[PDB]
Design an enzyme around this catalytic site. Structure first.
Site, PDB file in Angstrom:
ATOM      1  N   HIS A 102       0.790  -1.221   0.000  1.00  0.00           N
ATOM      2  CA  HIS A 102       0.000   0.000   0.000  1.00  0.00           C
ATOM      3  C   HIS A 102       0.827   1.279   0.000  1.00  0.00           C
ATOM      4  O   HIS A 102       0.307   2.363  -0.287  1.00  0.00           O
ATOM      5  CB  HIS A 102      -0.992  -0.024   1.154  1.00  0.00           C
ATOM      6  CG  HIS A 102      -2.091   0.968   1.006  1.00  0.00           C
ATOM      7  ND1 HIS A 102      -2.225   2.050   1.849  1.00  0.00           N
ATOM      8  CD2 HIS A 102      -3.088   1.071   0.093  1.00  0.00           C
ATOM      9  CE1 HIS A 102      -3.271   2.768   1.477  1.00  0.00           C
ATOM     10  NE2 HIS A 102      -3.810   2.198   0.412  1.00  0.00           N
ATOM     11  N   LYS A 104       3.014   4.359  -0.993  1.00  0.00           N
ATOM     12  CA  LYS A 104       3.182   5.213  -2.159  1.00  0.00           C
ATOM     13  C   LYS A 104       4.447   6.025  -2.033  1.00  0.00           C
ATOM     14  O   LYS A 104       4.529   6.912  -1.189  1.00  0.00           O
ATOM     15  CB  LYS A 104       1.987   6.153  -2.355  1.00  0.00           C
ATOM     16  CG  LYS A 104       0.640   5.435  -2.494  1.00  0.00           C
ATOM     17  CD  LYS A 104      -0.029   5.299  -1.160  1.00  0.00           C
ATOM     18  CE  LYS A 104      -1.440   4.735  -1.282  1.00  0.00           C
ATOM     19  NZ  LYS A 104      -1.508   3.748  -2.393  1.00  0.00           N
ATOM     20  N   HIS A 318      -8.186  11.189   0.166  1.00  0.00           N
ATOM     21  CA  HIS A 318      -7.497   9.915   0.056  1.00  0.00           C
ATOM     22  C   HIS A 318      -6.168  10.029   0.845  1.00  0.00           C
ATOM     23  O   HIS A 318      -5.469   9.045   1.060  1.00  0.00           O
ATOM     24  CB  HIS A 318      -7.278   9.524  -1.415  1.00  0.00           C
ATOM     25  CG  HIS A 318      -6.770   8.123  -1.594  1.00  0.00           C
ATOM     26  ND1 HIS A 318      -5.429   7.825  -1.695  1.00  0.00           N
ATOM     27  CD2 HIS A 318      -7.427   6.938  -1.678  1.00  0.00           C
ATOM     28  CE1 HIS A 318      -5.280   6.513  -1.837  1.00  0.00           C
ATOM     29  NE2 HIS A 318      -6.477   5.951  -1.825  1.00  0.00           N
ATOM     30  N   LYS A 320      -4.028  10.367   4.296  1.00  0.00           N
ATOM     31  CA  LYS A 320      -4.181   9.856   5.661  1.00  0.00           C
ATOM     32  C   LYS A 320      -3.189  10.654   6.499  1.00  0.00           C
ATOM     33  O   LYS A 320      -2.034  10.812   6.114  1.00  0.00           O
ATOM     34  CB  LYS A 320      -3.851   8.354   5.793  1.00  0.00           C
ATOM     35  CG  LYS A 320      -4.469   7.436   4.734  1.00  0.00           C
ATOM     36  CD  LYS A 320      -3.688   7.504   3.391  1.00  0.00           C
ATOM     37  CE  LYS A 320      -4.126   6.375   2.433  1.00  0.00           C
ATOM     38  NZ  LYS A 320      -5.599   6.457   2.086  1.00  0.00           N
TER      39      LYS A 320
HETATM   40  N1  LIG Z   1      -9.103  -1.864  -4.763  1.00  0.00           N
HETATM   41  C1  LIG Z   1      -9.238  -0.783  -5.773  1.00  0.00           C
HETATM   42  C2  LIG Z   1     -10.043   0.362  -5.169  1.00  0.00           C
HETATM   43  O1  LIG Z   1     -11.179  -0.146  -4.469  1.00  0.00           O
HETATM   44  C3  LIG Z   1      -9.205   1.187  -4.183  1.00  0.00           C
HETATM   45  C4  LIG Z   1      -7.823   1.308  -4.331  1.00  0.00           C
HETATM   46  C5  LIG Z   1      -7.090   2.073  -3.428  1.00  0.00           C
HETATM   47  C6  LIG Z   1      -7.728   2.707  -2.371  1.00  0.00           C
HETATM   48  O2  LIG Z   1      -7.005   3.445  -1.496  1.00  0.00           O
HETATM   49  C7  LIG Z   1      -9.108   2.585  -2.217  1.00  0.00           C
HETATM   50  C8  LIG Z   1      -9.846   1.826  -3.125  1.00  0.00           C
END
Ligand SMILES: NC[C@@H](O)c1ccc(O)cc1
Ligand code: VO4
Length: 425
Positions: A102, A104, A318, A320
């Site tokens: 996860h 980045k 998005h 955090k």
């Molecule tokens: N799994 C792909 C999509 O649902 C998604 C991808 C990344 C995120 O942070 C949130 C949702």
């Protein structure tokens, strides 16, 4: 600017709100360095889109995509990449179930040196379009004079820490990047690295990753003086049957370490409905009814997304972040931007009567500590020495008719910004 903390550009807000904001194209631009090679760590990739974000002159320079995809998903990614001879893939091992890669991060190798970028955005168009996302930009790290003996290390140990993070992957393609980092001088770095890596950690190894790492740094590099803890995220794991299984017990305990009210910020259905994206913003807020119904207790901690200070109340988060504001929210003891959402998977969960820390995922964040700057606290910049908190304080509690956005149930009573309903499945 001591912090080098930035938000992404948002389409469709007054340009004044984009003045200090960055798009990925700005980040990869020739004004940032003469590119020679890069590594892109992330979760989701749109390879065709990504290559276009690089300036034409740099588009054929080698790119390493570090991902966690398996089986069919892995095939599809390889297929996306095939047409581009300059792209390699590194599949991060995910041996624990429900783990994700996860993190980045960009590693950007230039003629003039090296840059590290740690951020919150997936490498797909929509994550950089109308969302609130965060970016930390390293300084341009110079190559160590090839005839001198120095560590290139910073007071925050960022260099050694970034190397250990990459070392945990056990990946041949990252050893090259590790060797590149050894050759550079990262001594000017004023942030601490907080990583998560998949494993079950024992004894002194508990301190290395996840919320235990954060706890360790707050103990060693913060001093203590009713200062709330604020947590802000876009995904919510299964936290247990009540607050005492994890949230308030081990998690909060780390966050409140220094040398207690807990505010959690997570978009309501109403925040999502009236966003710039409308309901499809909810595709990136994957809180599922299956998780939520198990833990309705959590939702009395929830507060709305509000970001008038940065002109982004309509740009769903998005990003955090976690932080420790004073009781009047005028200053903070620290701030953390990271890819870690609110889950045990990302932060770690104690096993075997508390002698083992279990983490499922790769996660990466930077922690801003006033001590690293010679201070005791940061004053909050009230309008996006003083830290740029990207959303409004204090956080506003959910109204009695508010619900946490839950992605896999339908919303059909009221249409969104674009006159659409949301019927998932
Ligand atoms: N799994 C792909 C999509 O649902 C998604 C991808 C990344 C995120 O942070 C949130 C949702
Ligand atoms: O990419 V995920 O929060």
């Amino acid at each position: 600017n001591p912090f080098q903390f930035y938000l992404t550009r948002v389409s469709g807000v007054k340009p004044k709100y984009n003045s200090g904001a960055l798009h990925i194209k700005d980040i990869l631009s020739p004004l940032f360095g003469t590119l020679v090679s890069s590594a892109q760590f992330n979760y989701c990739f749109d390879v065709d889109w990504l290559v276009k974000q690089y300036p034409p002159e740099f588009r054929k320079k080698p790119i390493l995509l570090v991902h966690g995809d398996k089986r069919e998903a892995k095939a599809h990614l390889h297929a996306q990449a095939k047409p581009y001879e300059n792209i390699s893939l590194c599949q991060a091992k995910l041996d624990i179930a429900f783990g994700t890669h996860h993190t980045k991060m960009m590693l950007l190798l230039y003629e003039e040196g090296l840059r590290v970028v740690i951020h919150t955005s997936n490498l797909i168009h929509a994550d950089w379009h109308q969302k609130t996302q965060g970016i930390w930009l390293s300084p341009l790290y110079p190559r160590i004079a090839d005839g001198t003996h120095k560590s290139g290390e910073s007071p925050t140990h960022f260099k050694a820490n970034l190397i250990s993070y990459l070392t945990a992957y056990n990946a041949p393609s990252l050893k090259e990047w590790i060797d590149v980092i050894h050759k550079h001088d990262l001594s000017e770095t004023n942030v601490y690295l907080i990583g998560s890596t998949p494993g079950r950690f024992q004894g002194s190894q508990k301190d290395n990753w996840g919320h235990f790492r954060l706890k360790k740094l707050l103990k060693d590099h913060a001093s203590s003086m009713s200062w709330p803890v604020v947590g802000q995220f876009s995904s919510v794991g299964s936290l247990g049957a009540d607050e005492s299984k994890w949230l308030c017990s081990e998690f909060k305990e780390s966050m409140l370490t220094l040398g207690v009210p807990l505010y959690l910020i997570y978009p309501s259905v109403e925040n999502v409905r009236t966003s710039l994206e409308g309901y499809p913003a909810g595709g990136s807020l994957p809180y599922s009814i299956q998780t939520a119904e198990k833990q309705n207790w959590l939702h009395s901690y929830f507060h709305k997304w509000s970001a008038e200070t940065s002109g982004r109340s309509n740009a769903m988060p998005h990003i955090k972040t976690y932080m420790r504001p004073s009781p009047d929210f005028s200053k903070i003891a620290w701030f953390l931007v990271t890819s870690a959402n609110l889950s045990k998977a990302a932060w770690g969960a104690l096993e075997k009567n508390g002698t083992q820390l279990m983490i499922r995922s790769y996660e990466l964040g930077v922690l801003f500590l006033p001590s690293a700057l010679g201070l005791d606290s940061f004053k909050v910049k009230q309008k996006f020495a003083t830290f740029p908190v990207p959303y409004d304080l204090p956080p506003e509690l959910y109204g009695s008719k508010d619900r946490p956005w839950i992605w896999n149930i339908p919303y059909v009573k009221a249409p969104d910004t674009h006159g659409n309903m949301w019927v998932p499945s």
